[PDB]
Design a protein around this nucleic acid. Structure first.
Ligand SMILES: [Mg+2]
Ligand SMILES: [Mg+2]
Ligand SMILES: [Mg+2]
Ligand SMILES: [Mg+2]
Ligand SMILES: [Mg+2]
Ligand SMILES: [Mg+2]
Ligand SMILES: [Mg+2]
Ligand SMILES: [Mg+2]
Ligand SMILES: [Mg+2]
Ligand SMILES: [Mg+2]
Ligand SMILES: [Mg+2]
Ligand SMILES: [Mg+2]
Ligand SMILES: [Mg+2]
Ligand SMILES: [Mg+2]
Ligand SMILES: [Mg+2]
Ligand SMILES: [Mg+2]
Ligand SMILES: [Mg+2]
Ligand SMILES: [Mg+2]
Ligand SMILES: [Mg+2]
Ligand SMILES: [Mg+2]
Ligand SMILES: [Mg+2]
Ligand SMILES: [Mg+2]
Ligand SMILES: [Zn+2]
Lengths: 83, 116, 177, 65, 66, 64
RNA sequence: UCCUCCUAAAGAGUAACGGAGGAGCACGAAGGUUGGCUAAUCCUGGUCGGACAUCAGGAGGUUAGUGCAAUGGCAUAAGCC
RNA sequence: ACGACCAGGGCUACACACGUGCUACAAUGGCGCAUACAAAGAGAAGCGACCUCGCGAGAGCAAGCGGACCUCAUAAAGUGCGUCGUAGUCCGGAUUGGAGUCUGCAACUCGACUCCAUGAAGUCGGAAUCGCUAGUAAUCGUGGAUCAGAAUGCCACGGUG
RNA sequence: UUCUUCUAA
RNA sequence: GCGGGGUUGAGCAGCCUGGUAGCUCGUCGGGCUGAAAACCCGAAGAUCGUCGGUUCAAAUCCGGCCCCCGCAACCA
């Protein structure tokens, strides 16, 4: 996990989409390749799409997701079973 | 003989017999006995009830046998209902911390399951 | 008989108040507390039954009626006549002295106790519960025993409804919710 | 090996796999390292239905006692 | 009751860590010194503690300050 | 007498495909199809590689 | 060879290589008597308990029971201790 | 475009089979305090004392050294004393939940380490099979190259023997 | 004392 | 018409007065071998022919059946 003296990590181009989402009032999917971004409490209720190498999957950001990073909710290896 | 819900053994030394509580190991057991004044190399037999009743309030500061199994299970089921990566690792049966699953992930996956 | 003395001076006035009973004989009184250890794995030998009987003769101060199977079922490999579980029916003077020891001592000595239930009154006020281990009672010495027993406590009372047994036990501070 | 492949349009996709199938590979059974020319022969045939019960009809008969 | 079949039933002393000497009747016989009882069990204090549902933002803003 | 025509024989002479594992190609002597992608074929997907046979089989029938 | 039902036509009987099943035992109590008791099954609640042991009510009213086939019996019980 | 740039992803998957390894199953030991003895290397965007803070990983500040000078660096097994008394244990450490630190735009997929908790299998391993003739096998620690960080591998070095 | 075999460039 | 049989993939035991499944081979995983045999080692498998029934319980007991194996189907 990241240091606490640095603060949590989010990307600027995600931050200039969340504040755009809070202002102009949209339920639009914000598709974002930043899997490494810690969810901020203003991101709660934002339908944001997180890349998983191939496609985007909508992560409806619940309150219970604030500590965790966006890539935990967009799994990249699609596994079903060997038989 | 009885601390915090369970029946601690009576022949072991005090920093060893307290370890039976789900919630202390050896470092927190040395911190339980750090404020009860008890020398850490006495047995649970030949103690005092004035010492054992003092000893339970030391254990009552920290989270133990019944109360610790519930915060752990709430934290694991927190990951289940999120459906995060850590939650999928718990509800499939595979190791969560990113270990090897190609060879010898046996502690989560149980014994060997041959091809039918 | 402390709680029966406690029944006749505070419980009767409380239940006549909140239910508006006509007659004082209409109040729910408890009738019997039945202590079963149905030990179905006592078909192995006598000693899993006759010792578990004596673990209940310590809890309730009575020798238990070692009961037998009513019919024969074959999923359990028992026949009609095998002794399969011992019970104790407690009435009067030794009912309340048990019911004093139950709600005071034996209930807070349960490992991971968070409270009893309130959906456990068998439709007609008779509160039927059950405990997981026989050593919640101080009667059972922890050292001298060997097997994790378990009994189920069944309180039978003359409540016609279901809430009237739910309110009778709350008069004796019974740990529900 | 004979495998029945049950799916939609199996014969429309695998009727063009009839005939031989030559290989030229340095094999596993060859110990001098040389390369051998082998073959197999695949014959994809469809699932024709069963003949079913030919029930003799007592008007197509001629019974001589 | 019957004259033989029942065990020795005696009024005893049941003290606790809240000092409550309480005289019950029982088959234990000896002077009983309990550990927790109905007076000192946290069914009325600590059961609102032990659920630990918690909030997530109030934990997250606690770690640092913007 | 309908799988005898489909097999034909088993020798190296009556083939339809080859699989040259040194230079890694799958020819197809019905048309030409000398394409140098065999590890896509032998391991798996010939899904767009039965398809060129069907076009010239359609060309046997739309040119009728 | 014996027992039970039907064919047997409302007393008894009544045939067929007619339709159905049983018996060639058991029991020193499974007999005698006195005292007492009331079944199957299902819903609900309940430690391990599971569709089903035991336990607690309730429904139910003999669908249970009889050492066994079938019929006629049986609560005063012929059933159960 | 089979060339090229980028972003995220993959090489880190998991019904399983094998190879090479480390840590074990303990009493010739585990833990606790004390105390003795090395060799060989590395280092300037680097090695970083001392000092204060933190349970600890580490943080603040700042000497010294291109080094037989200063730093990394305390060698450990050992010896003395105490305890454990043959139990899945004061053996074992997997695994998991919190709570952290550091490196790095960035530790979710996937880093190492720390702290508290949890304490699986394992009680010396079937058929079989491997290494080794003397400072050897055995067991103990140390160092380096690679590297921002990331070894139980590799290449070196000594200690008991 | 038993102890077989190695297809085709 | 009367006997006997149906038991893992296959060839078969055992069903004993009902409480419970055995073998040879085949199969799986390792071992040996340059590799495949042979051999060594670890293994797993059954809803006991079908559908009813009687018993608390049926592979076993009873009744009917579908195949299969025999035997007898004759005096005219
Ligand atoms: Mg512990
Ligand atoms: Mg008549
Ligand atoms: Mg007549
Ligand atoms: Mg009789
Ligand atoms: Mg009578
Ligand atoms: Mg009689
Ligand atoms: Mg890239
Ligand atoms: Mg790789
Ligand atoms: Mg292995
Ligand atoms: Mg020692
Ligand atoms: Mg240890
Ligand atoms: Mg370095
Ligand atoms: Mg310090
Ligand atoms: Mg030492
Ligand atoms: Mg041992
Ligand atoms: Mg630890
Ligand atoms: Mg074990
Ligand atoms: Mg030599
Ligand atoms: Mg490095
Ligand atoms: Mg041959
Ligand atoms: Mg072989
Ligand atoms: Mg059977
Ligand atoms: Zn108290």
């Amino acid at each position: 996990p990241r240091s606490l003296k640095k603060g949590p990590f989010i990307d600027l181009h995600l931050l200039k989409k969340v504040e755009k989402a809070v202002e102009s009032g949209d339920k639009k999917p914000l598709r974002t390749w930043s899997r490494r971004s810690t969810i901020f409490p203003n991101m709660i209720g934002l339908t944001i799409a997180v890349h998983n190498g191939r496609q985007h999957v909508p992560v409806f950001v619940t309150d219970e997701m604030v500590g965790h990073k966006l890539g935990e909710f967009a799994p990249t290896r699609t596994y079903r079973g060997h038989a | 003989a009885r601390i915090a819900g369970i029946n601690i053994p009576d022949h072991k030394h005090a920093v060893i017999a307290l370890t039976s509580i789900y919630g202390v190991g050896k470092t927190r057991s040395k911190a339980i006995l750090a404020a009860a004044g008890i020398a850490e190399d006495v047995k649970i037999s030949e103690l005092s009830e004035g010492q054992i009743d003092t000893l339970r309030d030391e254990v009552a500061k920290f989270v133990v046998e019944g109360d610790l199994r519930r915060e752990i299970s709430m934290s694991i089921k927190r990951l289940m209902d999120l459906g995060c990566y850590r939650g999928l690792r718990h509800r499939r049966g595979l190791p969560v911390r990113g270990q090897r699953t190609k060879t010898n992930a046996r502690t989560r996956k149980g014994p060997r399951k041959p091809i039918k | 008989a402390k709680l029966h003395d406690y029944y006749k001076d505070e419980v009767v006035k409380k239940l006549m108040t909140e239910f508006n009973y006509n007659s004082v004989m209409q109040v729910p009184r408890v009738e019997k507390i039945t202590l079963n250890m149905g030990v179905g794995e006592a078909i192995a030998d006598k000693k899993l039954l006759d010792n578990a009987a004596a673990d209940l003769a310590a809890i309730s101060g009575q020798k238990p009626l070692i009961t037998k199977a009513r019919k024969s079922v074959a999923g359990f490999k028992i026949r009609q006549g095998y002794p399969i579980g011992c019970k104790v029916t407690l009435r009067g003077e030794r009912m309340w002295e048990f019911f004093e020891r139950l709600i005071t001592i034996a209930v807070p000595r349960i490992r991971d106790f968070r409270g009893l239930s309130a959906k456990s009154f068998d439709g007609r006020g008779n509160y039927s519960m059950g405990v997981r281990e026989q050593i919640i009672f101080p009667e059972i010495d922890y050292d001298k025993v060997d097997r994790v027993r378990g009994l189920d406590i069944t309180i039978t009372t003359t409540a016609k409804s279901d809430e009237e047994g739910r309110a009778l036990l709350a008069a004796f501070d019974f740990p529900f919710r | 090996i004979i495998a029945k492949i049950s799916g939609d349009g199996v014969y429309g996709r695998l009727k063009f796999e009839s005939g031989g199938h030559r290989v030229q590979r340095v094999p596993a059974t060859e110990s001098q390292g040389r390369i051998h020319t082998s073959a197999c022969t695949v014959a994809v045939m469809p699932e024709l239905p069963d003949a079913e019960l030919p029930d003799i009809n007592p008007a197509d008969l001629r019974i001589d006692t | 009751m019957k004259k033989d079949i029942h065990p020795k039933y005696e009024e005893i002393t049941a003290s606790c860590s809240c000092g409550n000497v309480m005289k019950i009747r029982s088959t234990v016989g000896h002077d009983l010194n309990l550990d927790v009882c109905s007076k000192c069990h946290p069914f009325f204090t600590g059961k609102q503690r032990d659920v630990a549902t918690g909030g997530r933002v109030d934990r997250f803003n606690k770690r640092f300050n913007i | 007498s309908t799988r005898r025509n489909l097999l034909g024989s088993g020798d190296r002479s009556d083939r339809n495909r080859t699989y040259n594992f040194p230079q890694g190609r799958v020819t197809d002597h019905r048309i030409n199809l000398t394409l140098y992608r065999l590890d896509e074929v032998m391991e798996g997907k010939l899904d767009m590689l039965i398809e060129p046979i069907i076009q010239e089989h359609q060309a046997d029938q739309l040119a009728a």
